[PDB]
Scaffold this motif. Structure first.
Motif, mmCIF file in Angstrom:
data_model
loop_
_atom_site.group_PDB
_atom_site.id
_atom_site.type_symbol
_atom_site.label_atom_id
_atom_site.label_comp_id
_atom_site.label_asym_id
_atom_site.label_seq_id
_atom_site.Cartn_x
_atom_site.Cartn_y
_atom_site.Cartn_z
ATOM 1 N N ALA A 1 -6.383 0.201 0.796
ATOM 2 C CA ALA A 1 -6.082 -0.370 1.867
ATOM 3 C C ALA A 1 -7.205 -0.641 2.803
ATOM 4 N N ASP A 2 -8.205 0.387 2.487
ATOM 5 C CA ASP A 2 -9.440 0.031 3.419
ATOM 6 C C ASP A 2 -10.319 -1.014 2.850
ATOM 7 N N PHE A 3 -10.377 -1.459 1.641
ATOM 8 C CA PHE A 3 -11.146 -2.717 1.169
ATOM 9 C C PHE A 3 -10.178 -3.913 1.635
ATOM 10 N N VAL A 4 -8.912 -3.949 1.717
ATOM 11 C CA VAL A 4 -8.392 -5.027 2.071
ATOM 12 C C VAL A 4 -8.299 -5.218 3.731
ATOM 13 N N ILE A 5 -8.407 -4.203 4.365
ATOM 14 C CA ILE A 5 -8.489 -3.956 5.887
ATOM 15 C C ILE A 5 -9.900 -4.499 6.162
ATOM 16 N N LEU A 6 -11.242 -4.189 5.376
ATOM 17 C CA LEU A 6 -12.444 -4.441 5.736
ATOM 18 C C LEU A 6 -12.476 -5.890 5.464
#
Ligand code: HEM
Ligand code: HEM
Ligand code: HEM
Ligand code: HEM
Ligand code: HEM
Ligand SMILES: C/C=C(C)/C=C/C=C/[C@H](OC)[C@@H](C)[C@@H](OC)[C@@H](C)CCc1oc2c(O)c(OC)cc(OC)c2c(=O)c1C
Ligand SMILES: C/C=C(C)/C=C/C=C/[C@H](OC)[C@@H](C)[C@@H](OC)[C@@H](C)CCc1oc2c(O)c(OC)cc(OC)c2c(=O)c1C
Ligand code: FES
Ligand code: FES
Lengths: 428, 256, 179, 428, 256, 179
Positions: A370-375
């Motif tokens: 989710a972090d990668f997508v958010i990033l």
């Protein structure tokens, strides 16, 4: 090192050829390698990547046959490829979205790895070679984008060669050398052309070793349990020959992917790109909405989270007597975000391979995802609040996951019961 | 910043089965020639493409005639001459007027919702739609804010976003309060500034809608070709997939 | 020992010397061409520059800003305490290398109207948007969010220094000569 | 297939790396392959060729970084690489004479093969792969020469694309396609740049297989006698490990070659080239002294020997109802001169390998050698008498040698006594 | 076809240890400027190279001054201006006058004996020597042969080989009988047409010899660099060879 | 048998169809682009063409010769029996395609003064040397030794046809229009 059967010359042409050069033999042992019976759709990305590397290279050679690398003709040259060259308009768009598909694939491919412990021994070399391939891919993808010589092309060229200016001391030199001058100009465009061409063959070469490596280690399955290596009998219980069982599966998948890919290239070829690159390069104006290519956004987010006034940036700047300031910190933060991922084989201390059997891990993993997508999402917003914060926490969780969380879970976490054999999981 | 409002126009070519309207383009070409051309060039558009299929599709004799209206400088001789249709429309006449060649592609009109680009995925980039709005976006009266504080030489535009805005129209933080901003392009159109042969209305609404469809094509000439290419690739692959599927299914059948 | 163990070094040694002599030129060829290095100086005409206007000019392939500042512009420049600046150095090649980032010290004139600087953000290179924009009535670099003030001093963001001032000087009442 | 021992992991880093990816292992078995103790200076050309391929490729990428493939800047661009680019003047000359050395080497390499029966089974594949490499080399070497866009560049470009115009029927199409237009123009230059780049990587790939092939067949010696394959003991009697025995011999040779090569590049860089290529390309004038590149002369001689009035040409034209006329005959004659050489494994019927033991063969061979030198010499004279005759007899002897002489010597000639072992010969 | 006679001048740069004469080049540059320049250009030679080491080596202030005589058309503005030393000498003024940038390299003066090129191997390609001859090859009287049959606008030249020759000077087969042929370049030199500062003789012999050394350098500026590079490569390799030799000898010693 | 042996063909088949559809455009992109195919015609000014002079002009990227022949030039052209020429067709696009290589049939005027042909040797492409050179008082192609006569007919060498005459015609007393 699995137990199967080797090449047997049949026809005369085969016996003749075999006693001289066993190309047929080796290609056989390669296409017949026994691979785990259980392998979900997540194992098809390796093929989609191969195809992309081939698609890119041929459409590339073709485009290089019409493109001229020179500041005064470069942009025009590509518009010509679009309007005049027979089918150029569709070859150009294929090469462009080819880069995008190439990355969507390599990320899906990468995360597949992080989750199933495909980087965990003995596959530690597959991983590093794959990691080099990844670095090359971006370096390439970058130089390519510079070629059209549009607004994004010119400034991204300015900014990316700028990252080397950040290196303390030598930095100004490394940069002048990359640019061949005092600024991104023709001398740069020209050398970038030569390298954009050359790199893909180097990638191709690595993909050979990448393949060689996982081939001489056997594939990994969603179980983490290796294939029984004690008898041709029980080995066959866990496997199925690659050809035709998986080539058909892979090719089949590859067709569905391409289906969607052509849907994009035909109907919305410009969706994944930046409208500002249809504006000729201007050395005296930086587009107000300059944004990186989507596949670069996450590492871009991380670089600009770290501004002059970030507590940890401040501390470092202090204890470094100034050397490590905000600028150079974001550079180190970005490259480090990648280097940290290259070291996963030595940070994930849990001896359980598949994360399908690590209930604690599963949670930090999906947060990483989710972090990668958010990033990625953040890289596209301005630097105003609350984005500066979101970007900060996100960057934070990234290193948190590799540098702290994984090393800790290795000691804490109580693992689940992994099937004793691929066989017993497949039949399930 | 720069994320404003753009009028969704239902163009004939938007859509997977979309196609240019041979007549729109024709009209558009007239507007571009009689109004826009005055300041804006189209340097990447070869005049002879006017003849090429999938566009305005004018017959060579006209195209050859048209191209005559330009004073090109021959590359070999260096001296001026008539314009051949193998020539590119000239550069922008007015030095700060941008080239319109790629303009229908170098602007977005639909910016995703949460900055998620989902608005663009369903409405396209909206380049023609944006150019449309910029034309039909000169209101008779400045926003009450700018009263008297209007930069001399620029004109307010309800769609343009990258222009300068009077100090009096920025709020507490600097953000502008007006929906648009100030362009250096004096409103181009005004009802019936062009008279279409067949009498088709020359309302600034229509004209602007046409020059757009034309400017869309000026930028994406192979639009229809590309879409036909699209279909084909999808059929080949919808079949090859279904077949490859069965071949797969009816093969693992001998294992699981 | 042996003098044979020496030869196998005098050899491998001379070898490594050649390989280097080979590798060097393959690297050095990428450095600036005799013509890129031949670039010199230029002269700019500031006749039309009205106060409140910025003139962007190309010099050595990078943009160079020439703003004739307003009173408002000079007001704020002079009202900032040196220690509130992120960069304290003038970054000005005309004055001493140790000068201080005092607006008075970042202009060509004494009236502090003529601000001449490299429109090259010091973070990674973009040309920051002018038009008295950003959070400090200066320039805003759209690439990574750096703000500069009316004197071109960095005041917020990744940029570490102030926009540099290049060797410049008025060689008459209406012409500045950069470089 | 020569008896030998293998690599085994000594250090820890080696045991770690080996259980994952045996790159070290394979590199060992490759560098330690046992090779005949007797191998004269004629076996060093294989290395000189490898070196050239590398030299050409690096100096190439470098040059590609400064060259612009576009008719209006192409020639100027190379003069810039000469006057401005740091050391360009010496990199340009190295790439250019690199082509020469590359051919002088491949010919010495080739004749070495013709004499010692290195093409005779089981080395029949090594030969064909090498033959493909040869074809690629010329195709490359040609496109390269077009790039400076000088007089020879332009017209050689005109003439070589013309050879395809000779093909009956399809020929006019094949040609328009190669030219991308109705004449050699920019569209051509541009696509030639893209291919000149691409081909060397394809050659590199073949050289891999060329090596793989002779590696899995064992080298050949001046004796024609194979290495005893019955015991590690007597095998070692005939052999010596490649490393360091031959790598030093080869590298030593390679140093003397390069000594002379640099002497040329430094002192007479323009000796081997045509002065007319320092004249910008003129589409309206063909230089009166247009001559091909020396390494192409022989095949050029053969093509222009066959004029309208040569007896076979007419016989040929007659039986072929006009189809095979003088123009297309010369084309077939030239390409055939190469195709004939590619078939030597199936025309030389003598079962004796080394021609050192074929007293009758030795004579026709040296005539072939003298013919090639003569052929080369003639390509550079005018078409007037007696050159038209010399060229004719020469072309004649070429086919004579492969098509008639070799097949016949196979049945006639009384061979000599070849040593029973490589050992016996080395000791001598 | 062709192939004639060229005067073998002993140039300073001819030889592996050859080097340009800084003054010749200087003189040559004057001749090129005061005589040749009139019709010939040197469009591949950047004026600033006059300063570069290994050639005329004039000081920047002079070079800068020199470059001033030329009237160049600035690429950005389009309007004319004084010439900067970052400019290339002009194109040939006289449209059919060839560029001299690469002349000493684009010409052969020594053609191998039996067509074996062994004459070129020992005497160089003789380009400067050929240009030398073409200059010092304008005789006052055509050969009695062409008396009256002299194409108009051309002049006989003893060294030139690719010119036209009167029907009256071709033998039984068409081959010309005259050592040279007819050029379109009226003999440019004539004793003391140029005055060298230091008085150095301006005999058409010397002038022509100087403009040659200059024209040689104009074409091969890195001549000296190349040769120094040569030596170096040879030393590295003469040593590395001797060593690699011993390493070889004293290694096979343990076998044969 | 089976209908499964059919599927493994209906599949491999549809496959080969796509691969082809792929390969074609990759090859077709090399054919003449829309810019080259747009080339049309040109007009040449023959005012200065004195008899004995050859005018070389570019057209479609290939050279086009325009010689105003002398009497000598027309003499020889007319003195050769069609059965003595190697190529018998006039290769003249203006007259019928079956015409005969008679000097009169290869000139544009009836005087045989205006010879207009492609200066493109029919062997492999070079532009043959002019100004009455060769062994037939015509043109000589330096590339492989082809000789052409004063009418541009091949008379010796690898060249198989006569230099072609392109669509040409005088559109007034001093201007020919090729193409
Ligand atoms: C690693 C595979 C490759 C990737 C990821 C890649 C990516 C790209 C990208 C992102 C662009 C810019 C897109 C645009 O045009 O706006 C581009 C342009 C280009 N690439 Fe590649 N490329 C690859 C391989 C190649 C190869 C092998 C060649 C040379 C044979 C090549 C030749 C070109 C050319 C000529 C352009 C400029 C024309 C254009 O705009 O498409 N590419 N490439
Ligand atoms: C040139 C792009 C790449 C290509 C063509 C490629 C291809 C492949 C293929 C075909 C496989 C085997 C099938 C599968 O399990 O998916 C594979 C496995 C793998 N790849 Fe990649 N890969 C690429 C990039 C990468 C990258 C960027 C990484 C991450 C550094 C990577 C890491 C791995 C790993 C860990 C495996 C698992 C091997 C195993 O199961 O033992 N690859 N790759
Ligand atoms: C790219 C240029 C080439 C390279 C790099 C190359 C390299 C080599 C090398 C390293 C060897 C072994 C050492 C030696 O015998 O010199 C070899 C052997 C050989 N080469 Fe080549 N070669 C090249 C081109 C060719 C060509 C053009 C032919 C003939 C068409 C050819 C025919 C052979 C044969 C017959 C052998 C002997 C193999 C045996 O003994 O089984 N090679 N080559
Ligand atoms: C197969 C090895 C190669 C051969 C035999 C070869 C041969 C040639 C030749 C004969 C020329 C003309 C040189 C001259 O006389 O000016 C040339 C030019 C050139 N080659 Fe290569 N080449 C090779 C590999 C490469 C590679 C890998 C590149 C990289 C694309 C390259 C780039 C160039 C360029 C840019 C030029 C034009 C400028 C110049 O060198 O004059 N070549 N090449
Ligand atoms: C000493 C100064 C000069 C030098 C060194 C010089 C040198 C040359 C050379 C080497 C050639 C070409 C010879 C060849 O093609 O092999 C030539 C041709 C020519 N020069 Fe000069 N020239 C000089 C002065 C002049 C002047 C003053 C004029 C104009 C009045 C001139 C007009 C021409 C013309 C028209 C040609 C073409 C002749 C032809 O090829 O038929 N030259 N010159
Ligand atoms: C010969 C020279 C070479 C090989 C240089 C190679 C560099 C290679 C790196 O890959 C290894 C590098 C591409 C990679 O850094 C990990 C990328 C994620 C960089 C991320 C990146 O992109 C931007 C971009 O695209 C832009 O476009 C308009 C604009 C940008 O600022 C406004 C950026 C940007 O600010 C950053 C940080
Ligand atoms: C896209 C790929 C392309 C177009 C590849 C083309 C490859 C072609 C062939 O390789 C197979 C070819 C190089 C090779 O034929 C075996 C050579 C012996 C051809 C020899 C050759 O050279 C000439 C030349 O160099 C010239 O310049 C000054 C001029 C020429 O006329 C006088 C010739 C010429 O008459 C011939 C026969
Ligand atoms: S380059 Fe200016 S903020 Fe980064
Ligand atoms: S192309 Fe003219 S003789 Fe061969």
């Amino acid at each position: 090192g699995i137990p199967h059967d080797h090449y047997e010359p049949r026809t005369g042409i085969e016996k003749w050829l075999h006693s001289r050069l066993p190309i047929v033999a080796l290609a056989y042992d390669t296409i017949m390698i026994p691979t785990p019976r259980n392998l979900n759709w997540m194992w098809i990305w390796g093929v989609v990547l191969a195809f992309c590397l081939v698609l890119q290279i041929v459409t590339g050679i073709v485009l290089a046959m019409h493109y001229t690398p020179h500041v005064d003709l470069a942009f025009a040259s590509v518009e010509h490829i679009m309007r005049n060259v027979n089918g150029g308009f569709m070859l150009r768009y294929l090469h462009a979205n080819g880069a995008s598909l190439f990355f969507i694939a390599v990320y899906l491919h990468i995360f597949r790895g992080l989750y199933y412990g495909s980087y965990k021994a003995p596959r530690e070399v597959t991983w590093i070679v794959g990691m080099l391939i990844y670095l090359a891919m971006m370096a390439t993808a970058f130089m390519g984008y510079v070629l059209p010589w549009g607004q994004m092309s010119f400034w991204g060229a300015t900014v990316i060669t700028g990252l080397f200016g950040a290196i303390p001391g030598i930095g100004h030199s490394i940069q002048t050398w990359l640019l061949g001058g005092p600024a991104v100009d023709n001398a740069t465009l020209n050398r970038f052309f030569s390298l954009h061409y050359l790199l893909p063959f180097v990638i191709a070469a690595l993909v050979a070793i990448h393949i060689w490596a996982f081939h001489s280690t056997g594939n990994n399955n969603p179980t983490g349990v290796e294939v029984r290596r004690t008898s041709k009998a029980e080995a066959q219980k866990d496997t199925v020959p690659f050809w035709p069982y998986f080539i058909i599966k892979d090719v089949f998948a590859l067709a569905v992917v391409l289906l969607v890919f052509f849907a994009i290239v035909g109907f919305m070829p410009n969706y994944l790109g930046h409208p500002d690159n249809y504006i000729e390069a201007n050395p005296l104006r930086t587009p107000a909405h300059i944004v990186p290519e989507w596949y670069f956004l996450p590492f871009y987010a991380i670089l600009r989270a770290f501004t002059a006034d970030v507590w940890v940036v401040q501390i470092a700047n202090f204890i470094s007597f100034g050397i490590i300031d905000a600028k150079f910190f974001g550079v180190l933060a970005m490259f480090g975000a990648i280097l940290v991922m290259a070291l996963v084989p030595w940070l994930d201390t849990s001896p359980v391979r598949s994360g399908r059997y690590r209930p604690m891990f599963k949670i930090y993993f999906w947060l990483l995802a989710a972090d990668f997508v958010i990033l990625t999402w953040v890289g596209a917003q301005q630097t105003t609040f609350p984005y500066d914060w979101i970007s900060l926490i996100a960057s934070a969780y990234w290193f948190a996951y590799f540098l702290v969380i994984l090393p800790i879970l290795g000691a804490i976490e109580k693992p689940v019961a992994p099937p004793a054999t691929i066989e017993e999981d497949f039949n399930a | 910043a720069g994320g404003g409002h753009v009028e969704d126009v239902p163009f004939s070519f938007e859509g997977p089965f979309g196609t240019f309207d041979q007549h729109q383009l024709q009209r558009g070409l007239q507007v571009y020639t009689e109004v826009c051309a005055a300041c804006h060039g189209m340097k990447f558009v070869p005049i002879r493409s006017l003849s090429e299929p999938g566009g305005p599709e004018l017959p060579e004799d006209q195209v050859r005639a048209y191209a005559t209206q330009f004073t090109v400088t021959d590359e070999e001789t260096g001296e001026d001459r008539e314009g051949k249709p193998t020539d590119h429309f000239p550069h922008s006449a007015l030095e700060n007027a941008p080239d319109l060649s790629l303009m229908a592609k170098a602007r977005a009109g639909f910016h995703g919702p949460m900055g998620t680009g989902i608005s663009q995925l369903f409405n396209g980039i909206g380049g023609p739609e944006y150019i449309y709005s910029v034309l039909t976006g000169f209101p008779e009266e400045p926003p009450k804010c700018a009263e008297g504080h209007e930069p001399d030489g620029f004109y307010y535009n309800r769609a343009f976003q990258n222009g300068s805005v009077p100090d009096t129209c920025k709020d507490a933080n600097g953000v502008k309060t007006t929906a648009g901003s100030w362009i250096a392009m004096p409103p181009p159109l005004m009802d019936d500034l062009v008279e279409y042969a067949d009498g088709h209305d020359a309302s600034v609404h229509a004209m602007a809608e046409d020059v757009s469809a034309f400017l869309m094509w000026a930028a994406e000439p192979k639009l229809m070709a590309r879409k036909q290419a699209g279909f084909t690739a999808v059929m080949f692959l919808t079949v090859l997939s279904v077949l490859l599927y069965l071949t797969n299914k009816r093969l693992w059948a001998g294992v699981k | 020992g042996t003098r044979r163990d020496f030869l196998y070094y005098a050899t491998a040694g001379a070898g490594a010397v050649a390989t280097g002599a080979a590798v060097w030129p393959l690297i050095n060829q990428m450095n600036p061409s005799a013509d890129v290095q031949a670039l010199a100086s230029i002269f700019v005409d500031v006749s039309s520059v009205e106060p409140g206007v910025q003139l962007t000019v190309k010099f050595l392939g990078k943009p160079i800003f020439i703003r004739r500042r307003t009173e408002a512009d000079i007001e704020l420049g002079r009202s900032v305490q040196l220690g509130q600046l992120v960069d304290t150095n003038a970054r000005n090649a005309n004055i001493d290398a140790g000068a201080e980032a005092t607006d008075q010290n970042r202009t060509l004139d004494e009236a502090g109207e003529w601000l001449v600087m490299w429109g090259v953000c010091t973070h990674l290179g973009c040309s920051p948007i002018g038009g008295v924009s950003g959070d400090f009535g200066g320039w805003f670099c759209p690439c990574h969010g750096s703000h500069y003030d009316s004197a071109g001093r960095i005041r917020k963001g990744p940029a570490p220094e102030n926009l540099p001032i290049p060797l410049a000087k008025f060689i008459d009442e209406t012409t500045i000569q950069l470089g």
